[PDB]
Amino acid sequence: SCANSATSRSCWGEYSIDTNWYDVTPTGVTREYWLSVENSTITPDGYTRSAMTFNGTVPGPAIIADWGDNLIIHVTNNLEHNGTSIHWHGIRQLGSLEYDGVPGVTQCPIAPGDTLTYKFQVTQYGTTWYHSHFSLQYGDGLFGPLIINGPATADYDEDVGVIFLQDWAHESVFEIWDTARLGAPPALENTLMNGTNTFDCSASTDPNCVGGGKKFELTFVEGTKYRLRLINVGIDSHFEFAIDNHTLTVIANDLVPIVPYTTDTLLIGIGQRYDVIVEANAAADNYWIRGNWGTTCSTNNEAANATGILRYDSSSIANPTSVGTTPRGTCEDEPVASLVPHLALDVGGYSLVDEQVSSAFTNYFTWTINSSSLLLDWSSPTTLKIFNNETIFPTEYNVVALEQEEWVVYVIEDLTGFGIWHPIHLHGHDFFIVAQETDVFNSDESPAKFNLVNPPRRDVAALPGNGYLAIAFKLDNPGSWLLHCHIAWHASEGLAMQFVESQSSIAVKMTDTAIFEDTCANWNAYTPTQLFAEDDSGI
Numbered sequence: 001s002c003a004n005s006a007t008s009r010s011c012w013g014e015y016s017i018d019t020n021w022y023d024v025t026p027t028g029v030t031r032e033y034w035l036s037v038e039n040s041t042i043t044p045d046g047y048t049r050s051a052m053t054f055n056g057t058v059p060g061p062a063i064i065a066d067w068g069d070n071l072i073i074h075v076t077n078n079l080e081h082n083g084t085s086i087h088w089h090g091i092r093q094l095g096s097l098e099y100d101g102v103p104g105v106t107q108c109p110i111a112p113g114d115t116l117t118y119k120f121q122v123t124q125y126g127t128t129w130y131h132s133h134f135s136l137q138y139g140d141g142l143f144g145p146l147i148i149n150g151p152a153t154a155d156y157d158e159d160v161g162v163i164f165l166q167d168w169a170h171e172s173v174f175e176i177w178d179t180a181r182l183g184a185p186p187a188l189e190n191t192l193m194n195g196t197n198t199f200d201c202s203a204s205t206d207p208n209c210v211g212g213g214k215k216f217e218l219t220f221v222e223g224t225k226y227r228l229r230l231i232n233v234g235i236d237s238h239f240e241f242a243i244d245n246h247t248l249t250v251i252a253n254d255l256v257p258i259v260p261y262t263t264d265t266l267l268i269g270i271g272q273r274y275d276v277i278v279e280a281n282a283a284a285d286n287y288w289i290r291g292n293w294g295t296t297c298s299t300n301n302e303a304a305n306a307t308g309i310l311r312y313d314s315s316s317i318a319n320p321t322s323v324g325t326t327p328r329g330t331c332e333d334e335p336v337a338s339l340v341p342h343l344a345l346d347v348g349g350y351s352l353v354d355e356q357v358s359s360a361f362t363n364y365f366t367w368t369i370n371s372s373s374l375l376l377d378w379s380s381p382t383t384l385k386i387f388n389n390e391t392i393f394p395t396e397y398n399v400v401a402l403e404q405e406e407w408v409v410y411v412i413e414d415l416t417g418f419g420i421w422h423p424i425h426l427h428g429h430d431f432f433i434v435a436q437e438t439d440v441f442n443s444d445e446s447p448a449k450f451n452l453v454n455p456p457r458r459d460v461a462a463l464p465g466n467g468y469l470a471i472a473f474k475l476d477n478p479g480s481w482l483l484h485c486h487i488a489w490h491a492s493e494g495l496a497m498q499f500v501e502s503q504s505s506i507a508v509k510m511t512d513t514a515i516f517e518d519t520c521a522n523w524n525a526y527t528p529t530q531l532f533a534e535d536d537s538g539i
């Protein structure tokens, strides 16, 4: 045993960075939270607008726990005109499928005025976030940080916490979805760094453009090592995070600690997390913090202003004049060779499932996976179907059945022709990136080039534009697991499928069945007279 400290971050008592957290979990304590999903008004960047929030702030409240703790999170929907459903990003939910928070898959939506208590253990440590998985709501601010303390692969002195990177509209995403769904994501009006940015309201006629937005600011004390927890939570944003004249030591990706590597800039797709350690070893000055919005990935009206300020002297009010590192300027992820899990694991014998992304136009632009666009019924989520002993699901549920070759390699191909790098998120599992390739998948040749020996391992990874992503995971978590592009427009357009894994091995407590039933009962009481019907894929 050793205690975690600034000079022994690898330690976690009897556990450590070498503990297999897929197999072993510390005993912790029960932590209880009450969250209210609210319809709010905020001014994050000098522009006043509506938001959908947890507890009236963007980001929502931090949920901070220790590895092994049991979370009880009472979520009350205080919106009037939407259901909601809260997902705990990257959280494995082993034995707690029904609290994954995917409406249409693991639950019915929480109706206005209802409460759903999510219960789960955190059997993972690091940086993640929680967010609505109900339509585009997280675009309107319905997300917050979820930090699980545990060991780390490099030493550091202070944890500064999360820095959210996002696009930010000056109106509700729900006002622009009808335009967006014609096929083209709109250029949004601004970006936020940890919930703030400047915006020039000086020439504006819009009463809501009140001005006074401020750059995100981060203060460093010289010689101190800081852990920063980077999350891209935009609707349709790509970042290449950098701090001028500072080196990032990358120590985790998503909820998987990695062998540390140094980089000047850090490519981050939507829903991806990185933990980096930054040593405040520069000349004391103000330095630009650069989101480096990927303009080739998607449009924004104020791409150049996706920045913040690092100060070594907090009393400085000067803008930085530092010179940035030339960004790679791509929509890629970090290179696979750089992302080596500290806890080394290999992909065993597998069955290969191949799926192909294309697009179509029905009522509006849709993405398809083997010709089918995901469209879920919020009143008949996949788990309800499973509880009713159904093994054949609607075509548009895009179900792939997995049954145990205890591993699956899932290859998703971009046949769309658009060359977009789609951040693909898999629920219920960390996956192994056996291939992430900019080329055409050849079912006879490509598999022999898969890396099965400790490849990158995480829960969000890019489908390369016009290429393929081959992700492996073990049949170790019975349930119904959504996989989707995390570009909110694309998710809403049906770029998604789901794995019904080991169906007959799913076990739910009567307590949790009653709860699920009750949520669906309340949802069904709501829908007859709702102001708004489902008008997207449901996820």
Ligand SMILES: *[C@@H]1O[C@H](CO)[C@@H](O[C@@H]2O[C@H](CO)[C@@H](O[C@@H]3O[C@H](CO[C@H]4O[C@H](CO[C@H]5O[C@H](CO)[C@@H](O)[C@H](O)[C@@H]5O[C@H]5O[C@H](CO)[C@@H](O)[C@H](O)[C@@H]5O)[C@@H](O)[C@H](O)[C@@H]4O)[C@@H](O)[C@H](O)[C@@H]3O)[C@H](O)[C@H]2NC(C)=O)[C@H](O)[C@H]1NC(C)=O
Pocket: 030, 031, 032, 033, 034, 058, 059, 060, 061, 062, 064, 147, 159, 160, 161, 162, 163, 164, 194, 195, 217, 218
């Ligand atoms: C980007 O922007 C975000 C702001 O949006 C910034 O987030 C900040 O991130 C930092 C670092 O990650 C956080 O600092 C840490 O905060 C920890 C918690 O601090 C607070 O809560 C403590 C616990 O309070 C509960 O427990 C005690 C018993 O121990 C009770 O007395 C108390 O009533 C609470 O009980 C309730 O909750 C527990 C579950 O949590 C239940 O089980 C109970 O039944 C009950 O319902 C409290 O003692 C303390 O005084 C604080 O209120 C702290 O442990 C840690 O050491 C550190 O301070 C910030 O909290 C976070 N700020 C926000 C607003 O989220 C972020 O830093 C920024 N990034 C950058 C780079 O600037």
Ligand SMILES: *[C@@H]1O[C@H](CO)[C@@H](O[C@@H]2O[C@H](CO)[C@@H](O[C@@H]3O[C@H](CO)[C@@H](O)[C@H](O)[C@@H]3O)[C@H](O)[C@H]2NC(C)=O)[C@H](O)[C@H]1NC(C)=O
Pocket: 081, 082, 083, 135, 172, 174, 175, 176, 177, 178, 532, 533, 534, 535
């Ligand atoms: C959840 O709640 C939001 C309200 O916060 C609903 O948003 C509304 O969505 C409708 C249907 O897309 C929007 O109507 C469209 O608006 C634009 C407005 O300029 C117009 O071009 C279109 O022809 C159409 O009328 C409406 O703007 C929007 N309302 C707000 C306040 O944003 C959303 O539908 C709800 N979804 C669910 C599933 O309950």
Ligand SMILES: *[C@@H]1O[C@H](CO)[C@@H](O)[C@H](O)[C@H]1NC(C)=O
Pocket: 033, 034, 035, 036, 055, 061
């Ligand atoms: C969030 O807001 C709700 C409703 O006011 C309140 O009951 C709950 O205690 C709040 N939770 C936090 C974490 O502030």
Ligand SMILES: *[C@@H]1O[C@H](CO)[C@@H](O)[C@H](O)[C@H]1NC(C)=O
Pocket: 039, 050, 079, 080, 081, 082
């Ligand atoms: C949020 O409140 C606004 C303003 O009252 C209203 O237009 C909107 O429908 C509400 N949205 C939801 C999802 O309840």
Ligand SMILES: *[C@@H]1O[C@H](CO)[C@@H](O)[C@H](O)[C@H]1NC(C)=O
Pocket: 198, 199, 200, 304, 305
């Ligand atoms: C945005 O950046 C441009 C330079 O890229 C700068 O000239 C302009 O004043 C900035 N706007 C805001 C609101 O900070």
Ligand SMILES: *[C@@H]1O[C@H](CO)[C@@H](O)[C@H](O)[C@H]1NC(C)=O
Pocket: 353, 354, 355, 356, 370, 400
């Ligand atoms: C999807 O279609 C491709 C091309 O026809 C086929 O090879 C693949 O097996 C299909 N996948 C599934 C799960 O049906």
Ligand SMILES: *[C@@H]1O[C@H](CO)[C@@H](O)[C@H](O)[C@H]1NC(C)=O
Pocket: 387, 388, 389
């Ligand atoms: C589903 O099958 C199980 C196992 O045979 C049975 O116990 C249960 O009653 C069935 N569920 C429904 C909804 O009929």
Ligand SMILES: *[C@H]1O[C@H](CO)[C@@H](O)[C@H](O)[C@@H]1O
Pocket: 261, 262, 263, 335, 337, 338, 339
């Ligand atoms: C991560 O590591 C790989 C392999 O060394 C490099 O190629 C990459 O540039 C980054 O440093």
Ligand SMILES: [Cu+2]
Pocket: 087, 089, 090, 131, 271, 425, 486
């Ligand atoms: Cu997510």
Ligand SMILES: [Cu+2]
Pocket: 420, 421, 422, 423, 485, 486, 487, 490, 491, 495
């Ligand atoms: Cu996409």
Ligand SMILES: [Cu+2]
Pocket: 087, 133, 425, 427, 482, 484
């Ligand atoms: Cu998801």
